[PDB]
Amino acid sequence: QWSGARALEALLTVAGELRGPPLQLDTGQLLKIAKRGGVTAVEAVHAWRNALTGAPLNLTPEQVVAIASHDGGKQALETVQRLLPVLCQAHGLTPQQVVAIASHDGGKQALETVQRLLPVLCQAHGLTPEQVVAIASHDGGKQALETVQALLPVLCQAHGLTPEQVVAIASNGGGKQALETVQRLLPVLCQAHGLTPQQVVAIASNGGGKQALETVQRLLPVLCQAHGLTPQQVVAIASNGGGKQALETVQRLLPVLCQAHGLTPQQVVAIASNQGGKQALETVQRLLPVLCQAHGLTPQQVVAIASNGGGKQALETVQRLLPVLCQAHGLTPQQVVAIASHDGGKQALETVQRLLPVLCQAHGLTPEQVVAIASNGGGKQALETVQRLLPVLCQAHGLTPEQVVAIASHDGGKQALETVQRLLPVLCQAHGLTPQQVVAIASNGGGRPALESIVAQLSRPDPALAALTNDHLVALACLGGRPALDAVKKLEH
DNA sequence: TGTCCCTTTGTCTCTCT
DNA sequence: AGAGAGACAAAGGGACA
Numbered sequence: 001q002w003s004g005a006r007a008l009e010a011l012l013t014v015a016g017e018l019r020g021p022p023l024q025l026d027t028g029q030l031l032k033i034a035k036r037g038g039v040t041a042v043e044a045v046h047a048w049r050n051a052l053t054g055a056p057l058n059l060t061p062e063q064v065v066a067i068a069s070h071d072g073g074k075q076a077l078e079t080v081q082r083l084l085p086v087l088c089q090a091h092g093l094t095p096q097q098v099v100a101i102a103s104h105d106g107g108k109q110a111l112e113t114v115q116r117l118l119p120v121l122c123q124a125h126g127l128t129p130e131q132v133v134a135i136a137s138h139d140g141g142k143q144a145l146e147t148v149q150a151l152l153p154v155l156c157q158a159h160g161l162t163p164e165q166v167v168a169i170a171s172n173g174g175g176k177q178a179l180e181t182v183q184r185l186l187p188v189l190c191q192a193h194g195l196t197p198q199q200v201v202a203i204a205s206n207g208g209g210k211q212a213l214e215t216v217q218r219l220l221p222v223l224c225q226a227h228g229l230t231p232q233q234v235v236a237i238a239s240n241g242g243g244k245q246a247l248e249t250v251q252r253l254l255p256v257l258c259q260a261h262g263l264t265p266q267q268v269v270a271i272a273s274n275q276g277g278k279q280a281l282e283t284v285q286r287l288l289p290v291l292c293q294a295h296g297l298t299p300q301q302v303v304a305i306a307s308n309g310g311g312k313q314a315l316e317t318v319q320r321l322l323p324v325l326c327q328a329h330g331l332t333p334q335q336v337v338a339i340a341s342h343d344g345g346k347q348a349l350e351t352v353q354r355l356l357p358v359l360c361q362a363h364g365l366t367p368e369q370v371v372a373i374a375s376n377g378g379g380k381q382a383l384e385t386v387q388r389l390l391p392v393l394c395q396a397h398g399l400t401p402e403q404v405v406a407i408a409s410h411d412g413g414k415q416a417l418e419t420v421q422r423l424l425p426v427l428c429q430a431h432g433l434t435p436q437q438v439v440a441i442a443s444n445g446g447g448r449p450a451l452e453s454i455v456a457q458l459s460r461p462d463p464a465l466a467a468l469t470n471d472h473l474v475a476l477a478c479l480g481g482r483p484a485l486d487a488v489k490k491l492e493h
Numbered sequence: 494t495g496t497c498c499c500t501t502t503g504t505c506t507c508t509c510t
Numbered sequence: 511a512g513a514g515a516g517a518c519a520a521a522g523g524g525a526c527a
Contacts, residue, residue, distance in 0.1 A: 040495070073496095074495085075495090106496070139497080173499060174498070177499065177500095211500070211501090244501090245500090274502095275501080276501075276502045276503065279501090309504070346503085377504080380504085381505065411507070412505080412507065413506095414505085445507060446508070448506085480510080481507085481508080483507090483508065
């Protein structure tokens with residue numbers, strides 16, 4: 001018989017119990033732990049169900065699932081209950097920071113290494129705890145911490161990088177590989193091809209940073225003479241997760257796409273310059289003629305859809321959903337293209353298909369409004385949040401549907417909507433801002449942190465901004481959000 | 494296998510102006 | 511408002527004990 005049978009059975013026996021107190025996990029959360037943390041992780045969560053939930057740690061189930069759903073999850077769980085007090089008392093980290101460090105493959109290694117190396121990293125190397133946490137919060141975080149300790153001096157001194165740059169390089173999966181490749185390849189890339197340190201840092205600062213740097217070195221000559229690419233265009237392609245794959249695919253498919261479809265190299269670069277660019281290119285080669293047939297989508301529209309992260313997913317989803325969204329939902333092809341032309345286009349298309357009739361019939365929005373909500377990165381999240389929160393925001397908080405749609409119609413719209421529902425009362429009743437001002441602050445990208453920064457300043461006033469009135473602070477917060485307040489917070493110093 | 498580390502792709506959020 | 515950064519997640523492969 002199949003050997004995985006006993007184990008699968010054990011998985012299900014134990015999984016059944018976890019639906020009960022004190023954790024109560026759903027099928028989705030249980031699948032997740034099983035898929036990545038495996039069987040021993042599911043058994044571990046059960047074994048330490050009580051010791052984590054409340055006294056004296058007090059971890060939410062969502063947090064227990066986050067620690068458990070990785071390779072070694074069992075080990076991370078044991079280590080968290082051991083090291084979270086140590087790290088919150090002896091180094092002053094928050095439980096959230098400890099959880100974030102724990103929530104990656106080999107989390108036990110990262111936590112123990114942070115416990116070991118944080119003092120030497122802050123004292124002898126002048127890093128902040130936040131920076132130590134960031135470095136540590138990726139797979140192989142133990143390796144990245146140890147490589148930062150060893151290579152920070154030689155990277156700042158012999159190679160001219162700032163600590164911030166070293167931290168940025170180190171704070172991805174395979175950070176150790178990226179750091180080491182930069183030490184070796186920075187003079188080669190700078191002095192042989194005229195790249196700035198900053199361009200090299202940008203290449204190095206993604207997962208697979210090492211792969212992308214080595215690929216830039218190899219392919220930069222062939223890309224710049226033969227295919228007529230600018231060093232600037234090559235750097236942009238390489239400056240993305242899986243840069244190596246995007247680069248190699250650009251060399252392959254640039255002439256093919258240009259000659260056979262009439263795309264410019266500028267358009268090709270834009271398709272290639274996201275995470276999964278490789279996938280976006282190969283999909284365009286296949287799918288463009290299919291999308292463009294019968295006077296359907298123009299090439300230019302296919303390029304736009306292609307030119308975002310997961311462009312492959314967006315392209316395929318349009319091919320599937322263009323007819324059913326146009327015909328049965330009364331959308332123009334142009335509107336479908338608008339919704340698809342953002343990171344997560346696939347998610348957003350699917351969510352419009354599912355929710356357009358609900359939001360229209362049940363909540364009284366127009367299609368135009370639904371499209372406007374959908375037509376940003378994270379459009380799925382914003383649509384789901386408008387569905388959840390429109391009744392409370394309008395009925396309990398006074399807002400018009402028009403104001404809710406405005407808040408929702410930017411990247412982070414979900415975050416903006418949730419924060420408004422959360423902070424509207426204290427902003428208006430405790431400090432006298434008008435609802436229209438709160439809406440105004442929140443109706444920009446970065447709505448959430450702009451609102452948080454404002455609430456911070458009115459509940460624990462920094463003298464640095466006391467010279468500003470509430471209205472001035474509002475105008476500032478609408479002008480440039482949290483960064484503008486923060487800058488002002490300094491300009492005064 | 495269980496654990497650790499590395500790489501790619503997809504999605505979401507905030508910044509920079 | 512569009513490009514850039516970066517953060518978080520899901521999933522697969524190498525390595526090894």
